[PDB]
Design a protein around this nucleic acid. Structure first.
Length: 858
RNA sequence: GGUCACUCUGCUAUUUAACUUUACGUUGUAGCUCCCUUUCUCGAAAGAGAACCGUUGCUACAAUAAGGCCGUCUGAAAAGAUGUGCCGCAACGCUCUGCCCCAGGGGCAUCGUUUAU
DNA sequence: TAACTGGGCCTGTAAAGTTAAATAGCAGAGTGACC
DNA sequence: TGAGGCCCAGTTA
């Protein structure tokens, strides 16, 4: 059983194609065997184009935020009890404070004029901690957050406002009518230092007025809780994110702000610099060499005049000849200079004289400040290595933030040769021998660490899966990469239009085609050479497969008929459903020299990768569920803003459907009619506010929404429900006893149910399943199923996408049918007479599968 | 000479991954508040007046995935005090396991890795 | 009275910082394999 | 910027 393969593969943003021929003698093809194609779905979010890992990272972030705020307030209450502000009777069973006032702003303002109750004081402290304002956290033209906070800081620094509470109450409430920020506005934010000042002033004033709980421990604890945050970077956070040195793989990259690395950059600039008059000898280089070290900034014109030069010869590679950008800095020794500045103003350094330190000491402090950012870590690396006065000055002034590509060892080895005049390549060759790649029968797993794009990463991991399936089944081959213009890097550019090279190069076989048995294709040529889309990727696959002058001929007609059974002419063709109609049809229609199918027979349909993850999440909107629980009526209630409302919501208003407020409904509907449904304009704030009967503003109204199912949240504390969302899988249930026909039932399983470890027993429209119902199987996203509509039908295998919770309907699509809007089909199955499972291998191994053990959730 | 690719340095644009925070928004519960269904009470009537529920606006507090776990102590156990406390919406893979498929060989995972105190 | 069907509507957000890394382009110094 | 979730109103067996 020997064959030989030169099968080509096509890469798309969501697709991968393959088609196998066997050119035998030397670069001269034969007829085809097993054409095929697989397809997946992108590593992005369809609507927004963000990364799926991005939503996950923001979930982690907000989880940590809420947890830390809860814990902060918890410790605040503990400190309140510990310092004797409140007694154990003032705390309820949940650990919350009973009769805690809801007037913290007014109390914060009155605390400058009178004494505060222990409960008023506790409310004030916890409110200050909870809304603890914005902290600069930074190492121009400000936006809106910074604008608002800076304006408020300037406002309480001028006149009638001693604290944010006074300014807040008086100005905010009398000018706007509310104190907090509303609907994305930032104009009421205070800087955390302003609130810290409020806290110190409040403690002092309360001590004046005879507050008993002005304890030092209490003040320290409240101030700590207010000010403390975790460091953004700590420990090995920077090191874990570093790359690998080019020559020394066991050694980390050197920091850009170190004497060694900065001088390495300087030497690269100097040695590589050439003057043109219609290189630079060691004396001129050595003149310029130590000039930037204490001369502040070395521009190119200063270098020219420093070495004399002329006006007749030039230093190559510079733009803007007319604008005379000769003061563009040739070199700035920024790390050395910043260290010197720091030690000059704060510590001890004569500005005229050059600050000095063991070159290794400069390297240590540069490394410590680039790799560690908090004072604890920095001193923990600089305590025993150097002494504390300079350490304090440097900790207070210096901040370095980038790296280079060569390790400190390799640099300390290279820089000497570069000072002597040798170049980077010459020094690297003299040291490492100017030679610095195992091949395998299977391509090993892809590395993701060499490119940002998850789209490309997933596309190429699936490309590797496909080519390794080719290598497994159809022997080892001689592959012809072909990546699309859309496939490389898309979204903004892709929406406007609407790494594997090296990996394969070094990690897999080539069978002696000179140097390489590969051909990197140029699909432009593919578009030219060919002399509402189905599985159309045969094109790029074999046009990649077949080192050309670029226009050689062979014949096509067969290939079209193998790609589509209805092809080689009009598409009303029968499209052979079996392999033997394929062989017969193609053979006889091409009758002539039977170069093609007979023994190879290959029916193709795209291999669509399935999604059987169990992870997921419910919807992020919280809705009232009091009626959903207490009276089991299948509705929820949610506020809707008037600027986003429509007549459907207006008719579903809570106080309209129960006739409570009919005239309010009439006025709102009247205004929305007056603008033809333009809710953004009918109820525009500060241009067209809506006023209820009696003069009260209306900004949003509660609207009822049909709630057949959902997940209940905060069950210990409230009646809240959220839409189910993220159906992870739906399990089938087969029952015959219709007294006659045999029926199907489908029960959906969501993510919150895989989290609560519950396995439902309610068919979408049907009701409870007993031991009478017979479980058939369970399917997920993008699984293949058999499909027999009714009495008479072709079995019509197709892939499954969605299930409808209302009636158990199924969104489907077949091979080459991918566009959801264009090509999904939606079949019902209460009477479907057979619905079956299947498996599709990478290539085309469409063998049915079946399991009868109902797989539970964990 | 031309082309392509690669190593290093400088600048520009874009993208990725990780972390610390703020301000919202949503739901609930209090309080004050705009309306308003219903039911009652005083009424001979005219009319008042209470109550639950709904609900407009503002303030506060709680929750903000569903689910699970940590360190530190007073000590015998129940526990009780306490923390700049910690994972959970992604991708990838086949050492441990489960399923599915064809003594191996795979695919998919609720298995494992990035991943943790 | 129960399914089937074509249609259709609602879905969490903005801002402020510390970082590392990848691609592309331009400029500068080299190298290799090809054509 | 889109697709999943799933209801709605009319029709049908």
């Amino acid at each position: 059983n020997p064959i030989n393969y030169i099968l080509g593969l096509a890469i798309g943003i969501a697709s991968v194609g393959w088609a196998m021929v066997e050119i035998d003698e030397e670069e001269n093809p034969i007829r085809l065997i097993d054409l095929g194609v697989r397809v997946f779905e992108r590593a992005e979010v369809p609507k927004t184009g963000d990364s799926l890992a991005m939503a996950r990272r923001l979930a982690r972030s907000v989880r940590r935020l809420t947890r830390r705020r809860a814990h902060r307030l918890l410790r605040a209450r503990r400190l309140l009890k510990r310092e004797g502000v409140l007694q154990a009777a003032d705390f309820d069973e949940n650990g919350l404070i009973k009769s805690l006032p809801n007037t913290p702003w007014q109390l914060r303002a009155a605390a400058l004029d009178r004494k505060l109750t222990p409960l008023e004081w506790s409310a004030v402290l916890l409110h200050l901690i909870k809304h603890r304002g914005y902290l600069s956290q930074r190492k121009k033209e400000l936006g809106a957050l910074l604008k608002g906070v800076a304006n408020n800081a300037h406002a309480l620094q001028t006149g009638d406002f001693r604290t944010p509470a006074e300014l807040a109450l008086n100005k905010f409430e009398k000018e706007s009518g509310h104190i907090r920020n509303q609907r994305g506005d930032y104009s009421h934010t205070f800087s955390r230092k302003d609130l810290q000042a409020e806290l110190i002033l409040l403690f002092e004033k309360q001590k004046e007025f005879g507050n008993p709980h002005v304890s030092g421990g209490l003040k320290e604890g409240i101030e700590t809780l207010l000010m403390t945050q975790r460091p953004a970077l700590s420990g090995d956070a920077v090191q874990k994110m570093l790359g690998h040195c080019t020559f020394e793989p066991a050694e980390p990259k050197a920091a850009k702000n170190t004497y060694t690395a900065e001088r390495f950059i300087w030497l690269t600039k100097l040695n590589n610099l050439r003057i043109l008059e219609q290189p630079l000898t060691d004396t001129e280089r050595a003149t310029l060499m130590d000039e930037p070290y204490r001369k502040s900034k070395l521009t190119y014109a200063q270098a020219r005049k420093l070495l004399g030069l002329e006006d007749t010869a030039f230093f190559k590679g510079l733009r803007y000849g007319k604008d005379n950008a000769e003061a563009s800095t040739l070199m700035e020794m920024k790390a050395y200079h910043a260290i010197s500045r720091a030690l000059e103003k704060e510590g001890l350094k004569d500005k005229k004289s050059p600050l000095n330190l063991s070159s290794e000491l400069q390297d240590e402090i540069g490394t410590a400040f680039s790799l560690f950012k908090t004072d604890e870590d920095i001193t923990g690396r600089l305590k025993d290595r150097v002494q504390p006065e300079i350490l304090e000055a440097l900790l207070k002034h210096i901040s370095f933030d980038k790296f280079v590509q060569i390790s400190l060892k390799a640099l300390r080895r290279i820089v000497p040769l570069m000072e002597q005049g040798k170049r980077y390549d010459e020094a690297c060759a003299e040291i490492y021998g100017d030679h610095y790649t195992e091949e395998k029968i299977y391509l090993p797993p892809i590395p993701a660490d060499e490119i940002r794009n998850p789209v490309v990463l997933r596309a190429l991991s699936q490309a590797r899966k496909v080519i390794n399936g080719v290598v497994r089944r159809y022997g080892s081959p001689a592959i012809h990469i072909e990546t699309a213009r859309e496939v490389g890097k898309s979204f903004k550019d892709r929406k406007e239009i609407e790494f594997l090279c090296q990996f394969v190069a070094d990690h897999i076989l080539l069978t002696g085609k000179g140097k390489r048995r590969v051909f990197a294709s140029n699909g432009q040529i593919t578009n030219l050479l060919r002399g509402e889309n189905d599985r159309h990727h045969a094109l790029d696959a074999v046009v990649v497969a077949c080192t050309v002058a670029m226009p050689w001929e062979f014949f096509a007609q067969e290939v079209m008929i193998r790609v589509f059974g209805k092809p080689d002419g009009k598409p009303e063709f029968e499209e052979a459903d079996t392999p033997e109609k394929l062989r017969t049809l193609l053979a006889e229609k091409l009758s002539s020299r039977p170069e093609a199918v007979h023994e190879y027979v290959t029916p193709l349909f795209v291999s669509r990768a399935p999604n059987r993850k169990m992870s997921g999440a419910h919807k992020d909107t919280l809705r009232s569920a009091k009626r959903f629980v207490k009276h089991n009526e299948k509705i929820s209630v949610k506020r809707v803003w008037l600027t986003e409302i429509k007549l459907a919501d207006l008719e579903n208003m809570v106080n309209y459907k129960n006739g409570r407020e009919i005239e309010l409904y009439e006025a709102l509907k009247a205004r929305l009619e007056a603008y033809g449904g333009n809710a953004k304009q009918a109820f525009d704030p500060k241009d067209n506010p809506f006023y209820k009967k009696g003069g009260q503003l209306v900004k949003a109204v509660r609207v009822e929404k049909t709630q057949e199912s959902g997940v209940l949240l905060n069950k210990k504390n409230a009646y809240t429900i959220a839409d189910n969302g993220d159906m992870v899988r739906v399990d089938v249930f087969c029952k015959v006893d219709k007294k006659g026909k045999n029926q199907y039932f489908i029960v959906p399983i969501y993510a919150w149910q895989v989290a609560e470890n519950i396995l439902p027993d309610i068919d979408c429209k049907g009701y409870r399943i007993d031991d009478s119902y017979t479980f058939c199987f369970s399917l997920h996203k993008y699984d293949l199923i058999a499909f027999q509509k009714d009495e008479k039908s072709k079995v019509e295998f197709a892939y499954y996408i969605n299930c409808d919770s209302s009636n158990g309907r199924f969104y489907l699509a077949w091979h080459d049918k991918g566009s959801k809007e264009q090509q999904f089909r939606i079949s019902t199955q209460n009477l479907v007479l057979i619905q079956k499972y299947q498996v599709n291998e990478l290539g085309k191994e469409i063998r049915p599968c079946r399991l009868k053990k109902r797989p539970p959730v964990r």
